[model samples]
Target: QSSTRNELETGSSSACPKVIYIFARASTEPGNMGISAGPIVADALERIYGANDVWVQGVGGPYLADLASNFLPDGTSSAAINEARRLFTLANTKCPNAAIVSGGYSQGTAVMAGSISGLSTTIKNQIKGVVLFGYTKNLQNLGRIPNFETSKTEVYCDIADAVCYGTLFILPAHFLYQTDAAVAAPRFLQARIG
Candidate 1:
């Protein structure tokens, strides 16, 4: 990132802008972060955009099942969210002119949504686009966002969500729409990201 910052400071330009990846649900539990899809995504992004264009935000130790996971408990109910925002702010501070490409999967998508929803009007305009994968939420407010939604103004629902019908022991992987695009077109409401 130091190199990227320097390039941006020196007025470098690329065909594509920098991208920020938010990794989903990494806990201290043995199999949690280990099974995370970050490595795969990093590899692919490096091949396409090079490592410098891609940055993955990781969640620290402690599984969601753990009552005291680093960012899960009451003391830090959304520490990861806070940290992601901090990282974004830092990146922008370093490269005031850089365009941003944001994406996340599953729980990370929730964080991405929260960030978009919580941003001030000035902050929201800095964003270029969003690509979400493997997730679901009641985004009533997000319905009319211009580029963020589809023509119908509704989220795409996959047929394979049936397997997630159970308790916490069988946490929902909710693997639907597992395509190369990761997600389908967003439901268009008012503006692209209204």
Candidate 2:
């Protein structure tokens, strides 16, 4: 078993019955941690799996690295979506039995949704669960990902969050998933992997 730079390899490369979390960070300046999804989800996963059984990775692209890209679609998000597909493909190829949990927040969630939609049904079926926080696809008018077990999908949106509302107003709610997401995600994933 081997590892790659993109992955936060916490477990032995050969560990069977593994779980991998692929998360996309919210839109912000490169140094800004104002709205990050990975840390919350990563903390949850590590807590559940002893920090040595769960692997985490972050997807990338202009749409994801920059929030302004969300103002209009210019094919940048597709790159992030493609990157997600690649990560999924690699994880499935390397660990066919591994449970895959994935999601994102804000603009990143939009990319995750698009990536899931683009995956083949076979690949989609391999996913254990999906968690989306502060999703902006509704504002973007994007359709939902198909083939995921509806019961295993958790989409969280603060009613007052303007980002999820798809309006010009970006409120504090958009950057406030750290508290709830960290607690809820592990519970959701635990149910799936159990």
Candidate 3:
């Protein structure tokens, strides 16, 4: 997206953002990015990467059945998996230099997890950082996202949050992801990124 000739001769697509961020919204949440903790983290990521350099895209799914979705296949969503595949490929192809950082909260974590699982090594290499908030994996005895290195991942099951703790009940901490997301977002991105 240069001066037209800058397009083909030395093509630069303005659509290619610096940090490719894919956030899967919480179950039943409104907006492409989600109304809750998702945006707070997105904004914080903006702080770390510079506002305009980040390309934030939502997974765009039904949040996939909420409660049971965490452990079930439908919770992953065919579209969610595919969305990750496409987004990662497009980002890596268009802007190989762009750093990728993806995240989700509550049941939305499943989307991010499954999304990373589907990616090939080429795509995964572009992922600089990853995070999960209020996820059930820790409690269920499950671990981090498949194939992703633990060094690049973080799971914040708030000490006060029931779900992260495996209590299977929602507490004030559950919906209060904004508090942790704010702190985690910038720190994770800044540290993981060069």
Candidate 4:
């Protein structure tokens, strides 16, 4: 847990900027900072807004839950969602001036969305935007954050993306968010930072 907490720190002394990023990693990858769309997008964020300006944090918990686990009665809550709430609350209190931008892919997206939905109105207002890549959750069912504008929320889903499709067919599309992140991260920064 210490290692996961350590991944949240930016180790920067500078004053916080207008934007803060919370990125969630894919399942089956090692550690909170896994090699997934989150890190890939975070890299682009670092490039757009200096490494210190864009603080990055990762979510924790069983990222590799099997399909059967999703059907369980207690599947709604998770360590990752808990961690995400803690981090977002901390960020809101510590850096109220910054607007948080969160992005998650696959199962990571599910954790982030669940966390955001449960957050208080005050904390939800701190969020500037949310980007979901390869969302596994049914958006029609969950809808949007109550206090957040629909325009601020963006969902990127490839018609063939297996994760979004919720199937094993065309497994390669699950990884396509890597390329999408590379493109979207910069655009997100450009729109928010400038």
Candidate 5:
């Protein structure tokens, strides 16, 4: 298969089924090597599949890029979406049968939602499922992603209240992978990715 990756953490270490994870905010930042979720996700993947076989690549640093460079947050998501598209194509070329479980946090959530809204149909056959963290949406397609309760207290980047009367009244609050319910449903998929 043909492909180009910006960064890959759990590259071809095993032969088991793999999941390409798009992390939330700086959860996968290169400098955030000290953070917890990225490593935890990697470990979980490894435990589920086995080391060296599960490929997990994360696109980090956009939030910082936005802050220091004044880049629009939406632009950051575009970069992520492009990267994700590249990965999906590559995965199709390499492991055409591999499952895809897209995820994000805060604005990263927006990136995942945007990918689903715009690109899901493009790879509808290749996507096993999608998951998002800190996501807010009124669309039925997105409502399909299984969500878990949130324990995130920070609510770092939203402008409205949480789930108002069954509708997301605010801009979506950014939450961690663990606390974000919208980001953890691929655990239930038994379908083909493509």
Candidate 6:
């Protein structure tokens, strides 16, 4: 199977996925990653890292692939946590120098937050940064990633996004993450990885 990647990407790791991207898809988006911002950021990252250096992987374990899971905080998946841990271990064990990037939208954010809660210092240190768009946890007033540095964690939540404001409905604001992703990739995430 081909490496599921954001458009404008090239190359796959012959060993472990390098410049690793582990983005969880939105509830309504298909495949692994979301069509919204995941690819946008991946494209930006690809431009900087060179297409042949980036690996875009998405969440399929237990994530926001179902609309019903959107309203819940924890979603319905610990498998997302399992997915994250496994991905981290895979990269850390093989490509210790790889720059790992984590991302998600809406309920996918919940999955990432849960995943971030339990990583050891060794795994946490391997991440370059995290991008959580349409972050549902904003509704809960929790913005910082547990056990992760706030200096490198970015949660882009539009004020009008219902998913960020405690509603099940997705306002158009929820989809504007591409704009934010583009900026974040070059400004923060890229510098960290580069």
What is candidate 6's lDDT per residue for 1-194, written digit by digit as tens? Answer: 23254321333345444477778767777766767776777777778777667777777645447767654556536666687677666666666778787887777777777787688888788888888888777666467777688877888887767767755674433366767888865567876773
- TM-score for candidate 2, residues paired by index: 0.80
Total colliding residue pairs, candidate 2: 0
Highest lDDT scorer: 6
TM-score of each: 0.54, 0.80, 0.79, 0.79, 0.55, 0.84
lDDT of 3 by residue, 1-194 (tens): 11011111122466566667777666666655677766777778767667667777766534343555544543456665676566666667777787878777776777777778778888888889888887755655465777788889888876776666654663343376676688966687678873
Tens digits of per-residue lDDT, candidate 2, 8-81, equal 33334476446788877676624211235566677678777866677777674333457556665622356777
- How would the candidate models be sorted by lDDT, starting from the highest? 6, 3, 2, 4, 5, 1
Worst 10 contiguous positions by lDDT, candidate 6: 1-10
Better of 1 and 5 by TM-score: 5
Give lDDT tens digits, candidate 1, residues 1-194. Answer: 21111222222334224554334332222222224333444444445556666544443322142324322322124655565465556446654454444444445444555555555555455555555443334233342333343332233334454212211123535344444332232221112322
Error of 4 at 109 (Å): 0.4
- lDDT for every model? 0.40, 0.66, 0.67, 0.65, 0.42, 0.70
- Candidate 3 vs. true structure, TM-score: 0.79
Residue-level error in angstroms, candidate 6, position 62: 4.2
Candidate numbers sorted by TM-score from highest down? 6, 2, 3, 4, 5, 1
Residue pairs with clashing backbones, model 4: none
Clashing pairs in 2: none
Candidate 5: worst-modelled 10 consecutive residues by lDDT: 148-157
**Per-residue lDDT of 76-99 in model 5, one digit per residue for the tens?**
446655655555565555555566
**What TM-score would candidate 4 get against the native?**
0.79
